[PDB]
Amino acid sequence: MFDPAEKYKMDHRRRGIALIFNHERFFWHLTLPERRGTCADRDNLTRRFSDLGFEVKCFNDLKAEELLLKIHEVSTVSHADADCFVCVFLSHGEGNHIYAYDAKIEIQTLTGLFKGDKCHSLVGKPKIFIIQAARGNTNITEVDAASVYTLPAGADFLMCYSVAEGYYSHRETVNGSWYIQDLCEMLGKYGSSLEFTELLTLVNRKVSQRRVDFCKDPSAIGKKQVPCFASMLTKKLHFFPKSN
Amino acid sequence: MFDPAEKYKMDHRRRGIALIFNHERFFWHLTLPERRGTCADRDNLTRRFSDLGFEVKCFNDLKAEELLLKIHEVSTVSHADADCFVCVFLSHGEGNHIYAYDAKIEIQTLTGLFKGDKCHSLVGKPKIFIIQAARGNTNITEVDAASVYTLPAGADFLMCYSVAEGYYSHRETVNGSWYIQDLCEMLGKYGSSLEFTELLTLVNRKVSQRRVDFCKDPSAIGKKQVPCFASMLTKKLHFFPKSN
Ligand SMILES: Oc1cc(F)ccc1CNc1ncccc1-c1ccncn1
Numbered sequence: 001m002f003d004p005a006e007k008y009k010m011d012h013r014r015r016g017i018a019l020i021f022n023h024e025r026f027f028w029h030l031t032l033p034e035r036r037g038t039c040a041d042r043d044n045l046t047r048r049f050s051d052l053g054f055e056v057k058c059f060n061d062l063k064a065e066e067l068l069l070k071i072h073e074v075s076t077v078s079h080a081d082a083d084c085f086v087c088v089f090l091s092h093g094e095g096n097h098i099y100a101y102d103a104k105i106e107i108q109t110l111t112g113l114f115k116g117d118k119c120h121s122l123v124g125k126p127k128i129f130i131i132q133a134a135r136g137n138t139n140i141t142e143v144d145a146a147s148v149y150t151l152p153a154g155a156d157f158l159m160c161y162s163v164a165e166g167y168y169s170h171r172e173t174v175n176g177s178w179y180i181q182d183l184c185e186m187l188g189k190y191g192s193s194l195e196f197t198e199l200l201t202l203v204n205r206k207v208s209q210r211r212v213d214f215c216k217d218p219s220a221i222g223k224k225q226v227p228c229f230a231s232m233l234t235k236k237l238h239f240f241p242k243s244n
Numbered sequence: 245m246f247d248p249a250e251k252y253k254m255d256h257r258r259r260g261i262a263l264i265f266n267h268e269r270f271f272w273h274l275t276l277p278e279r280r281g282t283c284a285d286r287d288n289l290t291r292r293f294s295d296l297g298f299e300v301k302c303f304n305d306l307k308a309e310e311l312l313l314k315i316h317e318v319s320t321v322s323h324a325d326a327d328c329f330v331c332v333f334l335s336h337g338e339g340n341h342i343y344a345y346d347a348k349i350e351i352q353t354l355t356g357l358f359k360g361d362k363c364h365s366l367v368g369k370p371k372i373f374i375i376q377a378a379r380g381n382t383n384i385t386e387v388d389a390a391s392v393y394t395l396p397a398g399a400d401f402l403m404c405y406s407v408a409e410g411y412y413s414h415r416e417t418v419n420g421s422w423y424i425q426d427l428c429e430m431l432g433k434y435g436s437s438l439e440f441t442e443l444l445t446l447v448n449r450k451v452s453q454r455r456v457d458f459c460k461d462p463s464a465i466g467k468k469q470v471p472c473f474a475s476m477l478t479k480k481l482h483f484f485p486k487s488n
Contacts, residue, residue: 150394230408
């Protein structure tokens with residue numbers, strides 16, 4: 001009965017929710033820099049995910065408690081009538097942690113709320129996390145060292161990462177993160193036609209190909225960016241237009 | 245002219261080398277169990293990779309020095325005339341380490357030898373690592389806890405993992421590892437037709453779907469296996485049959 005071309009069923013009434021936690025500033029006593037440009041990331045993502053049928057819900061500079069409450073809320077609501085779930089972190093991170101405004105949170109505990117154990121309505125449905133996080137140091141290009149582990153999650157999770165270990169994350173202070181720029185461009189051109197990992201692969205090409213030989217800053221030279229993704233998907237994932 | 249359907253060029257004279265480091269026993273003073281069944285993994289892989297045009301080269305129970313010498317050898321030979329490179333570890337691991345016979349080796353240092361910097365002949369060519377490693381506990385099913393970090397590598401690397409964090413790796417003592425059985429079956433049916441990550445996705449479905457409710461051992465119940473992969477590929481990867 002088994003089928004090599006099998007797709008996730010993307011014919012539910014609604015596409016689903018895209019959460020976007022967007023962190024620009026941080027509590028003084030953490031000594032983390034402003035992520036100038038993250039608002040371009042937030043806006044570009046919000047548009048592209050809207051266009052694919054997502055109920056996008058942004059949240060600027062939440063503290064740990066607020067963030068946990070919001071994501072727990074979304075986990076316990078029924079996704080019975082939904083194709084999939086997307087969650088995006090634009091912040092600083094270290095190891096297995098993302099930074100809220102006031103403290104770091106274990107990525108494991110955020111992804112764990114959708115494990116299908118904990119959230120029955122999303123069993124057998126794609127759960128995509130996109131993470132644009134790294135180490136805190138007119139349109140300048142600021143450069144952070146990779147810091148967030150390229151963790152997997154569980155069955156039917158796709159974890160997507162701005163940068164792999166050893167490489168470097170770039171953010172233009174007006175245009176935003178290189179990862180998110182190229183992601184959003186490819187979503188723009190291909191989101192509705194291409195399989196999502198085929199697209200994520202295009203993003204890897206586009207970001208790896210960005211030249212870093214002749215740079216305005218002398219010490220940003222030879223700092224290449226290579227993003228990855230960790231698939232535990234079990235079927236092809238397409239965001240074909242849902243019919244009106 | 246940027247192209248969403250673009251493929252790695254797989255028209256070089258030879259397909260390339262598949263290394264297989266296969267560890268069954270270990271130095272007494274490490275206190276690691278025999279991996280009974282790993283020979284089925286080694287043989288099944290050897291066949292399937294042969295059939296796709298690979299010069300397969302197996303190495304049973306090498307010590308650290310021997311293993312490093314062998315893999316460094318293969319890194320410094322010219323791959324100019326080759327499509328790609330495959331390297332497979334069947335052993336125990338912990339964190340960012342694989343076990344040789346006598347001691348553990350940093351996966352980073354093994355994958356590092358093929359980073360475009362260090363190995364010019366493989367720049368722009370797929371470098372696939374397949375890792376069937378976990379924590380040391382007629383045809384019995386032995387069950388190990390996930391232990392090896394699902395690390396990325398660099399540009400044009402595909403890292404493939406038996407099991408993700410939190411889940412469990414299964415090995416039948418005659419048929420071999422669940423990961424490798426389902427990988428080899430899918431290679432058998434689809435290797436030559438399907439795109440390789442499409443296939444790795446089928447392997448994720450097949451392994452996640454293995455029932456663990458009614459088990460011979462009482463304490464092996466509810467121990468699910470979900471394998472992942474970390475793509476930093478930049479093009480589609482096909483193993484179409486080569487002529488002559
Ligand atoms: O993925 C697994 C699998 C396990 F069995 C156990 C733990 C992890 C955590 N993942 C990581 N993934 C990718 C890069 C690094 C880590 C990392 C690195 C340093 N410390 C902790 N983690």
